Amino acid sequence: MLYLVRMTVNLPRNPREEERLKASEKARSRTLQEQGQWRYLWRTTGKYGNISVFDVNSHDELHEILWSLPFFPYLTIDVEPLSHHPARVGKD
């Protein structure tokens, strides 16, 4: 199933824990994309966040994936279920 997911990032104002967090975040998203759950990843133009499409088998699968993100504590997340559009040409 497909979900359109928007995330905005707000990291704390305060060390070099920062750069290990960011590398950890980037490493996690690499795996999820490679394995197929994180189908699409874009950056909203002018923003610190992403707009994504996830392809998973349950609400809980998506929930756990998001929860597992290093950034999660600092994320504002919106989840929107997507359905097949009858006029679609090709695959959803």
Residue bearing tokens 């923003």: 47
Residue 23: both structure tokens together:
């590398």
Nearest approach, Cβ of residue 89 and Cl ion (Å): 13
Give the one entry of its own copies, Cl ion, none that residue 15 binds, where binding means its C-beta sits below a cut-off of 5 to 8 angstroms depending on kind: none
Nearest approach, Cβ of residue 68 and its own copies (Å): 11
52 near Cl ion (CB under 5 A): no
Other Cβ atoms less than 10 A from the Cβ of 24: the count is: 13
CA dihedral 1, 72, 23, 59 (to 10 degrees): -10
**CA-CA distance, 1 to 10, in Å (whole number)?**
28
- Which residues contribute to the site for its own copies (CB under 8 A)? 1-5, 12-14, 25-26, 29-30, 33-34, 40-48, 50-51, 58-60, 62-63, 66-67, 72-73, 77-90, 92
Nearest approach, Cβ of residue 2 and its own copies (Å): 6
Task: Indicate left, alpha or beta for 36 from its phi (over 0: left) and psi (-120 to 50: alpha).
Answer: left
29 near Cl ion (CB under 5 A): no
Residue 14: both structure tokens together:
């305060």
50 near Cl ion (CB under 5 A): yes
| Beta carbon nearer to Cl ion, 1 or 72 | 72
